[PDB]
Symmetry: D2
Subunit: 445 residues, 4 copies
């Protein structure tokens, strides 16, 4: 009654209870109903959440994801559960099994990608395994033996096929590949996507989340689904997409995560005596994408910009993605101090009306801000976790600690919500969201 | 490496992870492999462990158990999982579905009972639900509406059919009904059980636990299975068992739990406006069994004795069951002080070689003590929990706290072992034992 | 910032820092400025708070108090610090050094008493000492050897000199002896106190606490100080007080504390082989004062009434002292259930406007309620602690737990306030109050 | 009992109780008896430990130290408490009041310096203050206004007067200035110190710590005290010390601490708009002393060497000071990996006989190792803390976490020992050492 929050032990227990409850056997759904399949970057965070519970099962989560890797190295953003419906677009709509030459056999997947947080999950698994003794280390090391090549092929596909011009930024062909479907970042690029005759469909997502203020609009879904038509028309061929896609953007946040992931995987490579050529390529990509991210930045504030490849235009918006350079490093000293002032100030974590000192997905002072509407404003625990972990890696121990503390305070209601209203703290999106439980589990230690 | 123990949050998370992992859907197995079905008093403890995680699912656990209640009110000690093998004796051996007129329809069960800890689980569910607000209170109250009569019929069957002579002690027809299969308590009664021609069988339990030092002997299993033959021969008829059973003992520990359970259920009855006649009967039974327990006690030490009904003999052994009167109250002041001195002294919790200050199942100084052998010596987390909870209810806050603290220290290895070696702390029995995880979850709060 | 509360470790650290900061050497002040001397029941709580930090120093605190015990057994409510000013009435006003035949030599004290919580502090010291090993047990046991007789003389003085008619209730000659100066309990007795020629004085308390809404009025202080004149006029002679005092009340809360303290001290005496005649007397007094408390109770609600000895009338008020019978036991079952319903319902802990689920000193629905005014409404951490500890000793583990949880939530601001505003949680009275820090330290474990 | 360790809250409480117990008013002694005055780098750590308890009192600690700063900027290593005896050499032996032109007025101090950890304490005070709201921020900011210039003069004195040749390393004229009196680092330099006519003296330190195995030898003390005679003979004149001192070493650990402290203080200066010329000088010194540390390093292992200025030779020893480059950064990637391998391997934290995974002051495999003898082997909580904090600032979050976890495990006995036996965990040196309590308080959060 007086305090509906849970203690740290109750919260850790409920988080673990949730993760096991979303386990289908060898894959964990991203949420019970809204996302009843395996999503790529959710699966990485699920592996992080499972590592304190079972290193073996955390490795299983990544093995399942990597078993769905495309022939060319791409990790698709959905690995569909066998016989499960209730998410749209589902496998019939993607038609990758029939159309895509590089699609896996004996797995059904989507035909687009998602950010490469996977190396970070591998590091957390290895860190847990090393505290657990010989048998558990052997599990994690056997996973490295079995999957190091697949991880390399994933990073190599990103570096070679989504950065064809060696600019150090990743090109996306769908806003879904950013992880942030309706971010204001993509609005001006989506405005130039004009659907042709689009085959009939009915959304599933807003049958589960019925409050229209919390999900994208019908007109946005028409553009999301039209881009699918464009990809299917060229049978998901990498070489043909640049010629046909109505949406081609360089995603600076994805690019910064890739830089970090390359550096992380390179250090794993050195510690576990992987091939020197692989380690050298990883360090090369880490520096290439760090530089690519820095090249986008405002010289006064450090804020990173996305780039619309079709319009040949920097995309200037006020979202959390602006803070990409903080994740990967590389900014000059003065510019990074300015970027931190922006982060901590009244446009983001310093905004006087926020319930928690956390990073809203869109600045509350932006014209684009909508406090309930998915990536247009709400506070996302997954981002809080990713920022806190990257900040700790930068050496910003107190900044990381504060994000963790506020994230745990927000999460102490036990809803494990997908995102939270930034002013009232109301849980929004799906409840029982796996990567929110995973963030809590990793934080609580 | 240096410290393989888990933090309170890691331990709570792993305990919850385990409980959900043993969940078959509407019943939780007592262990993954050794006990791959629902056991009656394990199910009560599972409900206690689930209450901090999901009041709804805790209620489901008790609903499933009570759906298997016999027509006469008996709660059987096993509710078998549909299609699951691997425990022996299984349903084919009991043959209750074919033979027992009072057996449930559409559930397969054993033909014997187990201690009535269920009311304690109901109290813990209600206590959790009241901290969680209106909707959760409604779940727990709807369970009371739906199951109060079944709980009454359970207590009434114990009081009327297993205490036919109104002595205030429960008669058992199998040592398995005590929850303590090979306790030294039953050795002299088992010595008078002479098997006839016993149908061939092969144990399953020692295929899973292969160390022979940790389980009962083949000769003990022959007697356990012969008693089954005696019960089947009279088709599990309550009225016929006293005439045919080679094993008839009054179990003072079971009797003390019943007294406590009656008092607990009576208080629930008063708080939730149940029928006055039911509450009055519960208080009557609570006092009858408190007196029955006290009547067994040594006048100098307070230690409670079991009674062999066939031999007409008090059973004097040195096991944790001696402390029955501490659970239910009723001893004169001087005698209870003596009993506490026995508990805290060098024969039990004070023994100088114990790794933890916990109650061994058999006194280490007894000729009967075997440090690995099931109920002949090891320390059982389930007993630690039951003693700590009953002690707190007596008002012995520090004694309860110390048992909890030592139990948590012992459990901090994360094996969730069925029992522990009292000197080395080695985990024994089944790992991943559900009621050990439940004790940890309840303790950690 | 977004949440100014302290973590448990920060709170425990700050509580201990405070207690050591208030240590003058061999006595701890009750607060830094408002109460810059040793008060008797504060000193008991200080000893409880010191026990987790230093058993030696906890023992010193009680040794210092008992060194000021009067020749007849009375423990006076203030032991003044040598050469310290800033509290009024000071030693000159009491004039016990010169007037009181029973006052101690080479300590300056007041001339009235306070509740006998001291045995509870001895129990907590012994419980800590027993967890700390041999040298620490030796310290606590030596304190018992040295002070058991003084503790007996304290209890004997209460039983013989403040319960002259063996009614099982303690008579007070000053409202200050209740520990609750301006409780509504005493208003009708104080209305019959008419000061004669009262020597001029200036208050000190409201120089420190200047907000007039938080302290008693000048008119009340005139009565407090006039009662001192009546005592001085008979030189504090126990035999003459009944003939001259304008204020003579039986305090049912003090009486219930005394019942509990006698039972606690008797159990200590048994455990440490103290003289049997002493233990027998303690148990006799425990039951006499239990019965005396029960005799006062409302036949419907169980609520305990104080008694005005001069007016020969029961004093019916709506304060926390009504709950005296819950501390010591003795109510018939049905009436204790009614009393608990009153405690947990909308007149006390269930009042809908309370910030915390805690017991206000006066019911918010009473015409006497004043949310800021000392004992006329505020929530006192010292009472939360006493009720929680007594409730645990009754066996009401969950009720005790809930009081401790809410008390720790309230105290997490780190002000260690004397009392708190019941609706807003505003800290009131002296900050850095020693017994509030002691409560927190005992709770946090 | 079965486990004498304290819970986190009990430990935090006892640490704070200790720190307040060692408070003389405006300075905290480094220990109760062994070190009954203010030491300079202890005072910095005391301020860190006080910051979670009282930002005001933490600031006072540094104000008291800086009030004893010499005219030339030097912070002396002892500020003597007025009229306190029991440490030798005391103020009479140093004779700085009468001989040293730069000694402060109305403070008594020693005549040598100690490592510049002070900026790290300022950062922790500011970080706490920023979580506590406006009044507390005002206190910390006022301290910066009042003392920024003194902090600059301290850093300037080190950079200009103890690095006269701009080598980026700090020259010591006494092994006591390293904070590590009897480190094997200094043995070959001390072998070239030949006392002349040394005035008679009696040690005080080994009257308190009487076990000869835990303190330096008489022969070492003769050399410590003779160096004082050489300084007094030139009246502590900075310009004359190079011409007369028999001990002149470049201390690479002190140098690395100075690099870190300059970087930390420069960031503070930027954040609080201090003069730009000061910030520029601080960053210049941070990089100069980083480079100076790196220049000393082994080309295979990265291990840092001290330099004997008189012998013009690198000092190669196997102590924790080898790890200086991990604190300040600057090693090439491959050599820093080698240095981390040395730290985590069998010569240091991975030695198989260590009770805790912590850094011994001297390698257990070195011929110089002595497991009880002050800096010749014991594990020092102060160094665990410094390494953990510096490692977190490098971004090595898991390495920092592991040091803190093991440090808290070691400290959970509550002795707050000066140092610990590396194999048995036996507390050694002074108990109730202030900077050990400070480490614990900072860690527990």
């Amino acid at each position: 009654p007086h305090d509906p929050s849970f203690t740290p032990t109750q919260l850790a227990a409920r988080a673990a209870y949730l993760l096991r409850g979303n386990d289908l056997g060898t894959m964990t759904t991203a949420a019970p109903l809204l996302y009843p399949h395996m999503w790529s970057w959710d699966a990485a965070f699920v592996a992080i959440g499972l590592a304190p519970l079972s290193v073996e099962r955390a490795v299983v989560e990544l093995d399942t994801l990597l078993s769905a890797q495309w022939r060319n190295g791409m990790i698709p953003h959905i690995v569909f559960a066998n016989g499960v419906d209730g998410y749209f677009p589902g496998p019939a709509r993607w038609a990758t099994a029939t159309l895509a030459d590089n699609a896996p056999r004996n797995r059904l997947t989507s035909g687009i990608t998602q950010p490469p947080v996977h190396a970070i999950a591998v590091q957390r698994i290895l860190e847990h395994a090393r505290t657990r003794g010989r048998s558990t280390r052997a599990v994690a090391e056997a996973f490295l033996d079995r999957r190091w090549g697949d991880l390399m092929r994933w990073h190599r596909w990103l570096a070679e096929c989504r950065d064809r011009n060696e600019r150090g930024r990743i090109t996306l062909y769908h806003g879904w590949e950013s992880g942030m479907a309706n971010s204001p970042r993509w609005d001006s690029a989506y405005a130039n996507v004009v659907p042709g005759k689009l085959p009939e469909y009915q959304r599933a997502d807003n049958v589960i989340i019925t409050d229209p203020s919390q999900r994208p609009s019908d007109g946005e879904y028409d553009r999301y689904l039209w881009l699918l038509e464009e990809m299917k028309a060229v049978r998901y061929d990498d070489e043909r997409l640049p010629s046909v896609m109505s949406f081609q953007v360089e995603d600076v946040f994805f690019s910064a995560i890739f830089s970090v992931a390359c550096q992380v995987l390179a250090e794993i490579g050195e510690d576990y005596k992987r091939p020197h050529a692989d380690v050298k390529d990883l360090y090369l990509w880490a520096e290439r994408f760090r530089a690519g991210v820095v090249e986008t930045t405002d010289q006064r504030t450090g804020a990173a910009r996305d780039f619309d490849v079709l319009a040949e235009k920097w995309l200037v918006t006020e979202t959390a993605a602006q803070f990409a350079p903080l994740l990967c490093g590389g900014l000059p000293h003065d510019r990074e101090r300015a970027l931190l002032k922006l982060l901590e100030g009244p446009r983001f974590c310093g905004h006087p009306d926020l319930k928690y000192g956390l990073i809203p997905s869109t600045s509350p002072v932006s014209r684009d801000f909508r406090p309930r509407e998915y990536w247009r404003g709400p506070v996302w625990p997954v981002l809080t976790w990713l920022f806190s972990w990257c900040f700790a890696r930068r050496g910003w121990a107190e900044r990381a600690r504060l994000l963790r503390q506020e994230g745990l305070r927000q999460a102490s209601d036990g809803s494990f919500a997908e995102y939270y209203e930034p002013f009232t703290g109301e849980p929004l999106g799906s409840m029982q969201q796996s990567w929110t439980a995973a963030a809590v589990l990793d934080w609580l230690g």
